[PDB]
Amino acid sequence: EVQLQESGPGLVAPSQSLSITCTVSGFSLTNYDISWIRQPPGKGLEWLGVIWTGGGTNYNSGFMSRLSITKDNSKSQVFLKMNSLQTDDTAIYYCVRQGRTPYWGQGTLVTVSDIQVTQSPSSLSVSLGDRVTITCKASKDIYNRLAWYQQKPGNAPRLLISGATSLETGVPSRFSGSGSGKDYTLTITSLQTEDVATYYCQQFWGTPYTFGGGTKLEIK
Amino acid sequence: SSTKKTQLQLEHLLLDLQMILNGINNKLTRMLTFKFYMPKKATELKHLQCLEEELKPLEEVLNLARPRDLISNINVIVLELKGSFMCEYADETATIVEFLNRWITFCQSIISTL
């Protein structure tokens, strides 16, 4: 049973540091890389960095100098520390097991007092039923290292598709992924009231593991 | 098809993988950024389809440093050996060094039984 659980401080003063602990179960940190991601309220997903199985780290260029990611393989814990806080740093923080099929934690809210990837409609306003396509196009070949996610208000993102084309367990077959090289597509056929959500792609061929801008789908 | 050529082909595959490893077991940290998909099962020749599918990303990583010539040699060999299967990938991914060591191991396994 795979689990990731983020514990954070809830509220922090802007002249102090932020520390979050990711406690994992059901697998070993000696076998899997862990990414940290955040989501400012009302905004898209952004990748912060990763700690590799062997213990090194790679960081998002915009945060590198104020970040420290470490881990304790024996306690199954990963630690994110962020200094020089800004009010801009209020966000939900998630840790992610970064295998072939990514597995996400629940995400903890903290309130403070390169391959580019372009995602298709910023917003879609459909009719019940209908078939829609969302595209995600990369600056260079990413060799099917592409995942699609569904996020509903007040919940963590849900993985729909990994490896560009592999439908995940428990996801309706109305969702389908296709594409190769640099251009990838998510197709939803006969969409349903349960499909109102914001959708994101993410590439993971080399760091940074960049997210598309999101597609907000609504019945209009 | 026959056993002499098959055996010679596997030894040459094994050697090409070791050649790549040694070239990098000498930008190394940047090359370790990339993760490779790994076979869930790799016991017999048809499982080389898991190797073939990863050769284009391997060449991409190596090109961050004679790459094309070594990779195309490996490609020609892998196609003969696997003959004429849908690859099943494990969920753990591997650095280039872990990737080469798994496939070097796989070659050594087949060779010794021959």
Residue numbers in the entry:
A (entry chain C): 1 to 113, 135 to 241
B (entry chain A): 5 to 30, 35 to 73, 81 to 99, 103 to 132
The authors write:
To further characterize the mechanistic behavior of the 602 antibody and engineered variants thereof, we determined the molecular structure of the IL-2/602 scFv complex. 602 engagement of IL-2 occludes approximately 740 Å2 of area on the cytokine surface. On the cytokine side, the binding interface is primarily composed of residues in the AB loop (residues 38–45), the B helix (residues 62–69), and the CD loop and N-terminal end of the D helix (residues 107–116). On the 602 side, CDR3H and CDR3L both contribute substantially to IL-2 interaction; notable features include hydrogen bonds by neighboring residues R100 and T101 and a stretch of interacting residues in CDR3L (S225, W226, D227). CDR1L also contributes to the IL-2/602 interface, including salt bridges formed by residues D162 and R166. Structural data revealed that 602 sterically blocked IL-2/IL-2Rα binding without interfering with IL-2/IL-2Rβ or IL-2/γC interactions. The linear distance between the C-terminus of IL-2 and the N-terminus of the 602 variable LC in the resolved structure is 43.6 Å. Assuming that the flexible linker between the cytokine and antibody is fully extended (>3 Å per residue), a minimum length of 15 amino acids would be required to span this distance. However, the linker cannot stretch linearly, since it must weave around structural elements. Consequently, a linker length greater than 15 amino acids is necessary for proper folding and function, consistent with observations from SEC and signaling assays.
IL-2 is a multifunctional cytokine produced primarily by T cells and coordinating numerous essential activities in immune cells. IL-2 can alternatively form a heterotrimeric receptor, consisting of IL-2Rα, IL-2Rβ, and γC, which has 100-fold higher affinity than the IL-2Rβ/γC heterodimeric receptor. Disrupting interaction between IL-2 and IL-2Rα eliminates the competitive advantage for IL-2Rα–expressing cells, enabling more potent stimulation of pro-inflammatory Effs. As an alternative IL-2 biasing approach, monoclonal antibodies that target the cytokine and block the IL-2Rα–binding site were identified.
